[PDB]
RNA sequence: ACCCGGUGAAAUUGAACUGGCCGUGAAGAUGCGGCCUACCCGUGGCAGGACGAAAAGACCCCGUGGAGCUUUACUGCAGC
RNA sequence: CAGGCGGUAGGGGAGCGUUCCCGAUGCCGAUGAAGGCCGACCCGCGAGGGCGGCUGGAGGUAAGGGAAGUGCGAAUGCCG
RNA sequence: CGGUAGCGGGCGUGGAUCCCUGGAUGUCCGAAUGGGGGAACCCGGCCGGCGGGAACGCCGGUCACCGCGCCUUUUUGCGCGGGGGGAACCUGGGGAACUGAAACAUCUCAGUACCCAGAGGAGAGGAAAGAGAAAUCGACUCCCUGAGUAGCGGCGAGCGAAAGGGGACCAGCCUAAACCGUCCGGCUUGUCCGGGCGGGGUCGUGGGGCCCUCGGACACCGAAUCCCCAGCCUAGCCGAAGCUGUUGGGAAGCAGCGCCAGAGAGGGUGAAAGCCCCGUAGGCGAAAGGUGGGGGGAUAGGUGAGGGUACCCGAGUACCCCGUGGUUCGUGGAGCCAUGGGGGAAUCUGGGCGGACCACCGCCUAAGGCUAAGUACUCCGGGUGACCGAUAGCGCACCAGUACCGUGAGGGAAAGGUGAAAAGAACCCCGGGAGGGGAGUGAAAUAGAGCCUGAAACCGUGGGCUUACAAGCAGUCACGGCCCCGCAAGGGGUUGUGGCGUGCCUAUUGAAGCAUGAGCCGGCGACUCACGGUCGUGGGCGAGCUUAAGCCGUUGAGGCGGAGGCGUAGGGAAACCGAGUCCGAACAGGGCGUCUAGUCCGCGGCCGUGGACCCGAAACCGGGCGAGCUAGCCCUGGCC
């Protein structure tokens, strides 16, 4: 039959323009008290997954 | 294709457009009658398009 | 509905093909079921017979086998030539066979 | 049991033109090496070898295998 | 002209053969189809393909393409 | 006068056999129905008949049960109906586990398998207390699409809608209640209550009742019911055109000259046939039965506009709560539909719904029922295959659900081919026969019935070479000898001596291995297909590419169909902005983007989901079958 979308990737990951993969950064949920600023700060953005992984990702989501 | 089909068999030269079949009536000796004037001696296959 | 025969006995027939190409005799009898028809004196065979009450001194004894119901074909009583049998309705109503080839009444 | 007449199975079987010793080799060789020995084919006997036959080891371990049993293992159900 | 060409897992390339389809209302076939049995012959690196003799007795399927129930030596395989 | 010859008798143009339609007969069992019973057997009652017929027997008829009408004096009678089977398909009541989750319990498998009830050529569903955001749609069902979207989800494995759009089909109706009439019953005697029947009534612009006013009541519509007909099914019929020569056992082959063709499909005939046979194209056909979704006729039925009244508008119902099911919804903000328990209304100024709740704005009219078509299936009939061809194809081409196995439920084979024609081998010979040798038939008997072809393992007979002082994965290289084919030179077969020499497969760091598999031969035997992905590739079109279901055409012909899908814009959780956008106070700085190329089809490699390369568990679950073995007990006998 025609193929699912996983929707846990779905829920977590975007696939940009020229199908890069991208996620939120790891390690931010909680503990963060003693967390440094800058540790929480750049935590808080995106980045790229890498090749390997990101193109696994993306036989997942093949609607997209 | 069925375009380049009908080209292939115009450069051929073996296509011919006729306006009306004459003799024929309904039977067969009479298209032979008529075949034979269009040069159609049966030395060679025809496809035979019309309404 | 029967097996459709286009001969009956006893029509005069032509043996056409086979060894008996050319012979011309009466249809001595027909068996639908195989198919086939007996004309006399054609396709005689050597049957050995046991000593019997019936065939005291035994050998051998002849008899006509049968043709094919195909290989024989109807003479006209008109024209004397074998033909293809053609049906006509008469006047009155019930039809009959007719030759093919100038138009007579087989019977 | 053995011999003659009659009837006539079986497990097993890669193929076999299937010897000994000392070596060797996946470390226990008819089959590799070097020696030794041996004319060809059987019959009655014995069981040392062919890691002989039989049973895809029951012991052991492995498998995020199965089942039966236990309880203050977990979760549930009957029952009360 | 120069150089390369051992090879298990595995990757790549080029082919051979089986059944069926188009080519076919064709062409080959009792002056003998398929299949079988021989061969010291021919072509091909090979898978193969021809030719000849014998058997056999009614089918066969070209060049060029198409499609798969397509190739066996082992599964303590299955059937005989 | 079946397969079916044989012996022995018949029938047919006075139209037989055979085919179709409608009758008749139809023993016993089976729903099995008088009763019993271990199906196919046993025993009756009532009424008739038969035999001499009282006893006895036979024959014909009748007698089960349940439901409804209760039409029935409950008793008793009468009437209509049910029961059981059916390949699959269908609805309903109940409902698993293996498995997946790489363990497992929620979850999955799946409301699947299976059990049970029922329906019928279909069944289900169906005329909104709908959808859900448009001031929209307008019964249901089915296909494509929306969409693997929205969502659901130990937010894991996985599961997975609806609206809308495109199509197939097309269809709508009947009641309950108010109120009028009548009929039997009540005894709280009555402008009363209850039950039956008829009229009336049918709703969301809310309708209907009852009273008042105009209209029309002869206009119009019209069955899903009845009647007729065409048409169709169940037998059939007509149906063009070839001769001669020749080889051959045989002509359709080859040769010569012809013919037909709305027919050159195919099958058969001794080999290869448009013109020999059956047919083919094209036509014609029913007294009888079935159908009749088309055509015509009829009947049931059905149709207005205001004002008034405030009489009616489906009850343990809505609604609320508790426990659950359904839905994409797994307790979630959890509505909606359903309902086992409790509480428990209203009759339009009434109720339900639009995802808690409330207000607003809207949609709808619950608690009664029926309804065609479009859809599903294939026991059955036909047609067709880049479907099989006797180890294949159904288990079965044949005497197969058989032989046989099994207490049983149940399991379950093998087995097709003489020849064109039986011409199926008289007769002689050997022999008890079997079997052969002559003869004879045939083109062929190396077609002889244990019969087409007739491979291989396997077993023999005959011949060539070779072998009894050499020890070996059986071969190989060389030389020599013998036998054979060759003018020659060359070769085939065999092998004496010399050289060299650790089977094949698998599994392995490593096997000649004393590790695995194989007695040998033949045949069956394993990487497929669908849908979706991702690359490569052959093409088509290109800022565009492309259709799906379906409709028309064909009957190995394609065309139409633009709904929809991908692409032409991205960024952001989103609102939103846009060649940008996001974080940010930023007119820092970064991230992701911009700086065009796509899409459709075919082929190939791989990936996801399907059993997914083939064979193999121990087990788990469902429904049945077994106490004729064995265990225990119950009844009745026997033995010591
Ligand atoms: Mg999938
Ligand atoms: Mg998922
Ligand atoms: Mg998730
Ligand atoms: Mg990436
Ligand atoms: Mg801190
Ligand atoms: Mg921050
Ligand atoms: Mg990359
Ligand atoms: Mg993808
Ligand atoms: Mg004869
Ligand atoms: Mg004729
Ligand atoms: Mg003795
Ligand atoms: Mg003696
Ligand atoms: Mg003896
Ligand atoms: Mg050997
Ligand atoms: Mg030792
Ligand atoms: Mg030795
Ligand atoms: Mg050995
Ligand atoms: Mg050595
Ligand atoms: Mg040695
Ligand atoms: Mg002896
Ligand atoms: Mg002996
Ligand atoms: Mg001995
Ligand atoms: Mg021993
Ligand atoms: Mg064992
Ligand atoms: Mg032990
Ligand atoms: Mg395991
Ligand atoms: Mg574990
Ligand atoms: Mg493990
Ligand atoms: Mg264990
Ligand atoms: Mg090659
Ligand atoms: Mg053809
Ligand atoms: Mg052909
Ligand atoms: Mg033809
Ligand atoms: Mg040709
Ligand atoms: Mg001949
Ligand atoms: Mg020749
Ligand atoms: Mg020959
Ligand atoms: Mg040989
Ligand atoms: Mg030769
Ligand atoms: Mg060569
Ligand atoms: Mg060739
Ligand atoms: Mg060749
Ligand atoms: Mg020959
Ligand atoms: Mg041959
Ligand atoms: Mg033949
Ligand atoms: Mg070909
Ligand atoms: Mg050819
Ligand atoms: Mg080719
Ligand atoms: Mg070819
Ligand atoms: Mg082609
Ligand atoms: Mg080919
Ligand atoms: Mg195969
Ligand atoms: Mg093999
Ligand atoms: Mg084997
Ligand atoms: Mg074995
Ligand atoms: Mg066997
Ligand atoms: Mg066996
Ligand atoms: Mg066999
Ligand atoms: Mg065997
Ligand atoms: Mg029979
Ligand atoms: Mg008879
Ligand atoms: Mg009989
Ligand atoms: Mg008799
Ligand atoms: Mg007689
Ligand atoms: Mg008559
Ligand atoms: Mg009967
Ligand atoms: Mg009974
Ligand atoms: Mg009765
Ligand atoms: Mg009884
Ligand atoms: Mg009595
Ligand atoms: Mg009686
Ligand atoms: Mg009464
Ligand atoms: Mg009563
Ligand atoms: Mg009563
Ligand atoms: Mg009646
Ligand atoms: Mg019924
Ligand atoms: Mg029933
Ligand atoms: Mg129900
Ligand atoms: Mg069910
Ligand atoms: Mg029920
Ligand atoms: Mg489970
Ligand atoms: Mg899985
Ligand atoms: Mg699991
Ligand atoms: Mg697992
Ligand atoms: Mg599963
Ligand atoms: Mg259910
Ligand atoms: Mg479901
Ligand atoms: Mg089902
Ligand atoms: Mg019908
Ligand atoms: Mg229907
Ligand atoms: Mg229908
Ligand atoms: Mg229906
Ligand atoms: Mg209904
Ligand atoms: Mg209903
Ligand atoms: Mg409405
Ligand atoms: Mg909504
Ligand atoms: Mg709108
Ligand atoms: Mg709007
Ligand atoms: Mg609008
Ligand atoms: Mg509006
Ligand atoms: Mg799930
Ligand atoms: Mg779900
Ligand atoms: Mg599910
Ligand atoms: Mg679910
Ligand atoms: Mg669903
Ligand atoms: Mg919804
Ligand atoms: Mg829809
Ligand atoms: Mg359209
Ligand atoms: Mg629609
Ligand atoms: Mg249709
Ligand atoms: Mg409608
Ligand atoms: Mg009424
Ligand atoms: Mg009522
Ligand atoms: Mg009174
Ligand atoms: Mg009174
Ligand atoms: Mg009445
Ligand atoms: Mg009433
Ligand atoms: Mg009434
Ligand atoms: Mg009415
Ligand atoms: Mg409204
Ligand atoms: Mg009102
Ligand atoms: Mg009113
Ligand atoms: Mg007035
Ligand atoms: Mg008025
Ligand atoms: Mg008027
Ligand atoms: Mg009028
Ligand atoms: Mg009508
Ligand atoms: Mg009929
Ligand atoms: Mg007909
Ligand atoms: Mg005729
Ligand atoms: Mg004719
Ligand atoms: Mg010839
Ligand atoms: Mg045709
Ligand atoms: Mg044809
Ligand atoms: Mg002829
Ligand atoms: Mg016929
Ligand atoms: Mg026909
Ligand atoms: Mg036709
Ligand atoms: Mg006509
Ligand atoms: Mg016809
Ligand atoms: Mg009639
Ligand atoms: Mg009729
Ligand atoms: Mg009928
Ligand atoms: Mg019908
Ligand atoms: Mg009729
Ligand atoms: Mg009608
Ligand atoms: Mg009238
Ligand atoms: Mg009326
Ligand atoms: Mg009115
Ligand atoms: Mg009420
Ligand atoms: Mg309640
Ligand atoms: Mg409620
Ligand atoms: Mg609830
Ligand atoms: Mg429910
Ligand atoms: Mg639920
Ligand atoms: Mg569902
Ligand atoms: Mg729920
Ligand atoms: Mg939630
Ligand atoms: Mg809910
Ligand atoms: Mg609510
Ligand atoms: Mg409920
Ligand atoms: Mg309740
Ligand atoms: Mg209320
Ligand atoms: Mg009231
Ligand atoms: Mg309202
Ligand atoms: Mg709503
Ligand atoms: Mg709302
Ligand atoms: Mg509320
Ligand atoms: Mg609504
Ligand atoms: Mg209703
Ligand atoms: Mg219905
Ligand atoms: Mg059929
Ligand atoms: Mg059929
Ligand atoms: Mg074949
Ligand atoms: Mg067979
Ligand atoms: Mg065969
Ligand atoms: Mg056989
Ligand atoms: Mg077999
Ligand atoms: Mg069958
Ligand atoms: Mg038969
Ligand atoms: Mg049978
Ligand atoms: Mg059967
Ligand atoms: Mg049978
Ligand atoms: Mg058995
Ligand atoms: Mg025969
Ligand atoms: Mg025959
Ligand atoms: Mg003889
Ligand atoms: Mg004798
Ligand atoms: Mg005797
Ligand atoms: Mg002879
Ligand atoms: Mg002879
Ligand atoms: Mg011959
Ligand atoms: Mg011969
Ligand atoms: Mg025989
Ligand atoms: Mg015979
Ligand atoms: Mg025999
Ligand atoms: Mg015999
Ligand atoms: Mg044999
Ligand atoms: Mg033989
Ligand atoms: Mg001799
Ligand atoms: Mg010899
Ligand atoms: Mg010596
Ligand atoms: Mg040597
Ligand atoms: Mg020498
Ligand atoms: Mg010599
Ligand atoms: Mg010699
Ligand atoms: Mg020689
Ligand atoms: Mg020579
Ligand atoms: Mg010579
Ligand atoms: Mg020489
Ligand atoms: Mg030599
Ligand atoms: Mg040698
Ligand atoms: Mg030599
Ligand atoms: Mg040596
Ligand atoms: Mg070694
Ligand atoms: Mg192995
Ligand atoms: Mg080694
Ligand atoms: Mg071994
Ligand atoms: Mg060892
Ligand atoms: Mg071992
Ligand atoms: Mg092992
Ligand atoms: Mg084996
Ligand atoms: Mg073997
Ligand atoms: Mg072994
Ligand atoms: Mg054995
Ligand atoms: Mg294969
Ligand atoms: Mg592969
Ligand atoms: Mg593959
Ligand atoms: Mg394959
Ligand atoms: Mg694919
Ligand atoms: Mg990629
Ligand atoms: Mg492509
Ligand atoms: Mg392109
Ligand atoms: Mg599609
Ligand atoms: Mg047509
Ligand atoms: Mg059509
Ligand atoms: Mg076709
Ligand atoms: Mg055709
Ligand atoms: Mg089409
Ligand atoms: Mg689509
Ligand atoms: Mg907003
Ligand atoms: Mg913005
Ligand atoms: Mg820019
Ligand atoms: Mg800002
Ligand atoms: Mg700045
Ligand atoms: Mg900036
Ligand atoms: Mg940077
Ligand atoms: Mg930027
Ligand atoms: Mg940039
Ligand atoms: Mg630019
Ligand atoms: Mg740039
Ligand atoms: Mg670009
Ligand atoms: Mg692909
Ligand atoms: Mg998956
Ligand atoms: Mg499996
Ligand atoms: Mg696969
Ligand atoms: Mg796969
Ligand atoms: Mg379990
Ligand atoms: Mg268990
Ligand atoms: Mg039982
Ligand atoms: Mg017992
Ligand atoms: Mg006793
Ligand atoms: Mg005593
Ligand atoms: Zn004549």
Redesign the pocket.
């Known amino acids: 039959?025609?193929?699912?979308?996983?929707?846990?990737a779905?829920?977590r990951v975007?696939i940009?323009?020229?199908?890069?993969v991208?996620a939120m950064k790891t390690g931010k949920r909680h503990l963060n008290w003693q967390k440094s600023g800058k540790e929480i700060r750049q935590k808080?953005?995106?980045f790229?997954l890498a090749k390997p992984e990101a193109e696994r990702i993306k036989?997942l989501l093949?609607?997209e | 294709g069925?375009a380049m089909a009908v080209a292939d068999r115009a450069r051929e030269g073996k296509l011919l457009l006729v306006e009306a079949f004459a003799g024929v009536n309904?039977?067969?000796?009479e298209f032979?009658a008529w075949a034979k004037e269009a040069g159609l001696d049966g030395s060679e296959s025809v496809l035979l398009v019309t309404g | 509905?029967?097996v459709?025969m286009?001969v009956?006995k006893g029509d005069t027939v032509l043996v056409?093909?086979?060894?008996?190409?050319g012979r011309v005799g009466k249809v001595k009898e027909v068996l639908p079921?195989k198919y086939a028809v007996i004309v006399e004196g054609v396709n005689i065979?050597?049957?050995?017979?046991?000593?019997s009450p019936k065939?005291p001194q035994?050998?051998?004894i002849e008899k006509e086998?049968?043709?094919?119901?195909?290989?024989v074909?109807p003479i006209c009583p008109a024209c004397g030539?074998?033909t293809?049998?053609?049906?006509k309705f008469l006047e009155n109503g019930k039809?009959i066979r007719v030759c093919?080839?100038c138009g007579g009444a087989l019977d």
């Open positions: 039959p025609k193929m699912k979308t996983h929707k846990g779905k829920k975007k940009t323009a020229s199908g890069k991208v808080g953005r995106k790229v036989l093949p609607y | 069925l309904g039977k067969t000796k032979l | 509905m029967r459709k286009h009956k056409a093909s086979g060894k008996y190409k079921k065979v050597k049957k050995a017979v046991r000593v065939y035994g050998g051998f086998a049968p043709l094919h119901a195909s290989k074909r030539k074998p293809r049998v053609r049906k039809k093919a080839k």
